[PDB]
Structure of Spike glycoprotein:
Amino acid sequence: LSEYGTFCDNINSILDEVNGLLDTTQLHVADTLMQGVTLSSNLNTNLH
Amino acid sequence: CTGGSEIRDLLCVQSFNGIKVLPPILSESQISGYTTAATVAAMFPPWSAAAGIPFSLNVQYRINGLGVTMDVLNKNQKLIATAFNNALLSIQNGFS
Amino acid sequence: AQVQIDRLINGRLTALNAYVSQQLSDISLVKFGAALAMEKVNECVKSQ
Amino acid sequence: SVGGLYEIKIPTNFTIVGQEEFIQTNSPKVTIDCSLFVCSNYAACHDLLSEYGTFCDNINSILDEVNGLLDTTQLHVADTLMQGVTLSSNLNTNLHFDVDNINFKSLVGCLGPHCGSSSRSFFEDLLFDKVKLSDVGFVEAYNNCTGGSEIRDLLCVQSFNGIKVLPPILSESQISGYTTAATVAAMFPPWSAAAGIPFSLNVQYRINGLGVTMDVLNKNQKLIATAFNNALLSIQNGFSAPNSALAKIQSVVNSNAQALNSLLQQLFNKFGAISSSLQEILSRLDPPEAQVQIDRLINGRLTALNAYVSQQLSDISLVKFGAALAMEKVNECVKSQSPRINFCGNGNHILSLVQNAPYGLLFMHFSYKPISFKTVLVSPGLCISGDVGIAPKQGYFIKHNDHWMFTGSSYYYPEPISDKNVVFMNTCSVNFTKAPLVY
Amino acid sequence: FTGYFPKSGANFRDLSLKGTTYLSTLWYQKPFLSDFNNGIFSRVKNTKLYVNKTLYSEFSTIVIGSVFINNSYTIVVQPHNGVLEITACQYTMCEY
Amino acid sequence: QYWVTPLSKRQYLLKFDNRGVITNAVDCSSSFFSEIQCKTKSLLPNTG
Amino acid sequence: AVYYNSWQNLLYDSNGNIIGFKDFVTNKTYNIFPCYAGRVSAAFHQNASSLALLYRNLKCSYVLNNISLTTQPYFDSYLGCVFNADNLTDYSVSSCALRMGSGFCVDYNSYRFVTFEPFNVSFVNDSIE
Ligand SMILES: CC(=O)N[C@H]1[C@H]([C@H](O)[C@H](O)COC(C)=O)O[C@@](O[C@H](CO)[C@@H](O)[C@@H]2O[C@@](O)(C(=O)O)C[C@H](O)[C@H]2NC(C)=O)(C(=O)O)C[C@@H]1O
Ligand SMILES: *[C@@H]1O[C@H](CO)[C@@H](O[C@@H]2O[C@H](CO)[C@@H](O)[C@H](O)[C@H]2NC(C)=O)[C@H](O)[C@H]1NC(C)=O
Ligand SMILES: *[C@@H]1O[C@H](CO)[C@@H](O[C@@H]2O[C@H](CO)[C@@H](O)[C@H](O)[C@H]2NC(C)=O)[C@H](O)[C@H]1NC(C)=O
Ligand SMILES: *[C@@H]1O[C@H](CO)[C@@H](O[C@@H]2O[C@H](CO)[C@@H](O)[C@H](O)[C@H]2NC(C)=O)[C@H](O)[C@H]1NC(C)=O
Ligand SMILES: *[C@@H]1O[C@H](CO)[C@@H](O)[C@H](O)[C@H]1NC(C)=O
Ligand SMILES: *[C@@H]1O[C@H](CO)[C@@H](O)[C@H](O)[C@H]1NC(C)=O
Ligand SMILES: *[C@@H]1O[C@H](CO)[C@@H](O)[C@H](O)[C@H]1NC(C)=O
C-alpha cells in the first residue's frame, strides 16, 4: 500500500475537505440563528 | 467499544476497521440553545425576532395582511391564541 | 501472497473511491439544504 | 409591561458600517490531455491505452462540458451585471468623481473602450494585485514556460504533462468594466441601477424604511455621506490586514493549485509496478512484461483522472450555486433592494454595491449601525376617541412632555401622531393603552 | 528517504574508555562489547591535545567483526593525527 | 568521547537547502509530532 | 553551478526525476528541461476551407523555429501565436461561435482575430448634471 503512492493521502484529503465544508456550514447555520438576537437579562426558564 | 458486552455494536466493528463518525464542531445542545434563544427573542421585549412588536400582535397583523378585517381578529384574540397553541400541540402529537 | 494482497488492495481502494464520490455528492445536497434552511430562518422565522 | 408600556432600547445616534462578501462565480478552467497525461510520448503506452477504448474521449468530453458550463455561467453573470444599465454619453469618470458628498472614485475605472483594459477600478486593482494566479496570472505563468528562464515553475511542469488552465471567455478586465458600468449607473442620471433616483436620496429612503424619521436624515445628509464614504474606506483598508473575503479568494486559488498538484503527483505513483516512469520500464523490460507494468500505470492513472473528473463535477456544481446566488444578490441588493431581511448581508441592510474579484464578485453591504441607545417606555398600540385602535408604522408610541407621540423604531425622535405614521383599526385590541384624549 | 538511520529519541552510549597503566578485564565484556546487528552511528569527539603548543588529534579506535580470530576478517578504524587508517584483515586480536 | 547508537532501516524526512546540504531531518516513526512532520513533508506543520 | 561536491554528479527534484548533471569528462554542469509539450487550439467554421490555429502561450518565433515551419500568415496575439487569422482586435462582435478566451474571438466571413463584447451599455445623450 505504501508502494501504491498517495492514494490514501488523497482519500483523507477529500474527506477532510468535505468535513471542513460541513463544519463551516454548521457555523453559518448557527450564525444565522443567532443573528440580531437580543434578549433581556431578566429572562428565566422557570417563571416566564 | 472497550466494554465487555457480548452484543458487538456494528459501529465498534466499523471503527476498528478505520471507519468512524466524528462529532460536529458545535454540539446539538449548543444548536438547541441557539434555537431556544431565537424562539424567546419573539415572545419578550425587545422582540428582536418578531419585527419589534409583541408576538400576538405580529400574528394579528400577519393574519390581517391575508385579507382579514382587524375587527373579528382582535375580538377573537383568545380563539386565535387557542387555535395557535392547538396547532403547536398537533405538531407535537404528530411525532407519536 | 503479494499478488493476492494486491487484488484485495485494488478492490478496497476502488471501494473507498466509490464511497468518497458518493460522499462528495451527498455533502453538496446537504449544503444546498442548509442554505435553504438559513433562508427559511431569515425569511419565515425572523421576518415574514 | 407596566400599565400598557414596555421597556425598549431605541437608538439615539447611528453610523453606516460596510461589510464585504466574496461570492465565487467562476473557477479556473482546468483542461487535461488524457492521452499526454496517461502516456506522455511513449508509443508502447499509447498502443495499450487505445485498447481501453473511449476512456480519454469520455474524460475530455466531461471536462469540455464542465468548462462550457463555466463559460455559460460567466456570460450569465456578465449579462446580469449589464442588465438594464443606461449611461449618459456625456459622462466622463476622469472629471465626475463624486456626487452628493459620496465619493465613488475608488469604485470606478475609466468608462468606454478607448481606455482599453484600464476600466479596472482602484478598489478592484487593490483586490487583484493580492492574487497572483488570476486569468492574467495564469497567462503570464504559462507564457514564461518557453521563455528560456532557468526557474522550474510548477505550472510549467503541469502543462508539459497535459494539465493546463485555459483563460475564461471574458477577461477579468471586461468583468471589471461591467461592474464599473453597473456602479456608475447608480450615481448619475438616469440612475438605471438605483430605482431611477439620486444615490443619496435612495440611501436616505432606505434608511427611513428601517424606522428612522426623515427629519434627522435630511438634516444629517453630510454626516450620512461621510459615514458612507468612511464605511467604504474601512472596506478598502480591511484588505491590508487578514480578511475573510481576501482569504476566501486565495482559498479558491490554493484549492485549485492543490488539486492540480495532486493530479500531477499521481504521475509519480507506482500503482504496484516496478517504477512510475515509462522510460525506466521500457529501458528494463521486454514487450511481454513491459506491457504488464505499463498496464498497471495506465489503470492507476485512468483511475486518478476519473476521481479528479468526479471531484471537478462536484466543485463546479458548488460554483454554479455560488454564481446563481451572486446574480440574485446583484439583482436584489445592487440594482434594487428586495424586502428580504438578511439576504444582502447581516443587520439593517441599507444598500449594496458590487466590485469585480478574482473568480467572483465582491459585494459591499452598507448597514445602518446604532451607536448609542436610550431606554424608553413604549406602547405597541393605543385606544383613542370612540374606542378606535391605532398601531404605529415602523415605530412606537411614547410619552414625551406628558403627551402621546410617535418615534421611529430605529431612531429616537419624538414626533406628533398622525395618519402618516399610524395603522387605523375600527375597534382597539385588548391591552392597547387607553388614551381617550388623543386626536 | 529510507536508509540506515538512528532511532530519534534513543540513547547514545559513550563507549570510550581512557586508562593510564592498568586495564580492567570488565572493559572487554558486555555491555562494552556490543552487538552490531544492522549497524551503528557514532558521534566521536576529536580530543585535541597539545605538545609544545603543537596540536595533535587523538580519539578511540573502533573494531567491528564477529569472533575476532585470525580465521575471520576484523574491520579496524584507527586515527593517526589526521590520517584515518581503515583496514579489514584476519588479525590476531589480543584478549585485551 | 565515542557515542554510539544502533542503525536500522528507517524512513526520514530530509531537508536540503539551496546549496545541497542536509540542514534538518525527521525520523517519521519516532513520535506523533514526527509523523505529522512527515505527513505534511514540512519541518513546522501548519496549526491544525 | 557550485552545489556539486567531488562525489556528486546528478541533480534530482523531490519526485526523483533527473533535472541536472555534471559531465564526468568535461566537469561542465547542465540543467535538464523537458522538451516542450502542448496542444494547438484550432478554430473551425463550417463555411471555411481552412483552420485558424492558436499555439496557446507560445511566441510565433518559438513556434516557427522549434515546432514547425508553415506557409500560413501569423501574428503574436495576447493568448499566443495565431496562424491563418487576420489580427483585427479593434473590431468587436456581440455574438461569437469561436471563443478563444480573455475577450477574444475568431470570426469567419478568411478568419479574423476580433475582440468579444457580448454586452454593451445602452447610451443616451441626455445631460449629466
Ligand atoms: C574507564 C575509566 O574508569 N577511566 C578512568 C581511569 C580509571 O578509572 C583508572 O585508570 C582505574 O585503574 C584501572 C583502569 O584499573 O582513571 C583515569 O584517572 C586516573 C585516576 O582515576 C588518573 O588521574 C591517573 O591516576 C593514577 O593514580 C593511576 O595510575 O590511576 C596516576 C596516573 O598517572 C593518572 N593518569 C593521568 C595523569 O592521566 C586515568 O586516566 O587512568 C581517568 C579515566 O577516565
Ligand atoms: C447640492 O448641490 C451642490 C451644487 O450646487 C452640491 O455641492 C457640490 O458638492 C460636491 C460633492 O461634495 C463638491 O465637490 C462641490 O465642490 C460642491 N459644489 C458647490 C458649488 O458647493 C451639493 O453636494 C448638493 N447637495 C446635495 C445633498 O445634493
Ligand atoms: C573534474 O573534477 C575532479 C574533482 O574535482 C578533478 O579530479 C581531481 O583532479 C586533481 C588534478 O588532476 C587530482 O589531484 C585529484 O586527485 C582529482 N580527484 C579528486 C576527487 O579531487 C578533475 O581534474 C576535473 N576535471 C576533469 C577533466 O576530470
Ligand atoms: C494586432 O492589432 C492591434 C490592433 O489594435 C495592434 O494594436 C496597436 O496598439 C497601439 C497601442 O495602443 C496602437 O497605437 C496601434 O494603432 C494599434 N495598431 C493598429 C493597427 O491600430 C497590435 O499591435 C497588433 N499586434 C500584432 C503583433 O500584430
Ligand atoms: C453621533 O456619533 C458621532 C461619532 O461618535 C459624533 O460625532 C456625533 O456628534 C454624535 N451625534 C449625536 C447626536 O450624538
Ligand atoms: C515572467 O518572467 C519575467 C522574466 O523572468 C518576470 O519578470 C515575470 O515576473 C514572470 N511572470 C510570471 C507570472 O512568472
Ligand atoms: C454559412 O453558410 C450558410 C449556408 O450557405 C449561410 O446561411 C450562412 O449565412 C453562412 N455564414 C457565414 C458567416 O458565412
Summary: Residues 19 and 36 of chain F are 26 Å apart (CA to CA). The pocket of 2-acetamido-2-deoxy-beta-D-glucopyranose (ligand 7) is lined by residues G 47, 108 (CB under 6 Å). Strands of chain F lie at 2-16, 22-27. The first helix of chain F runs from residue 32 to 40.
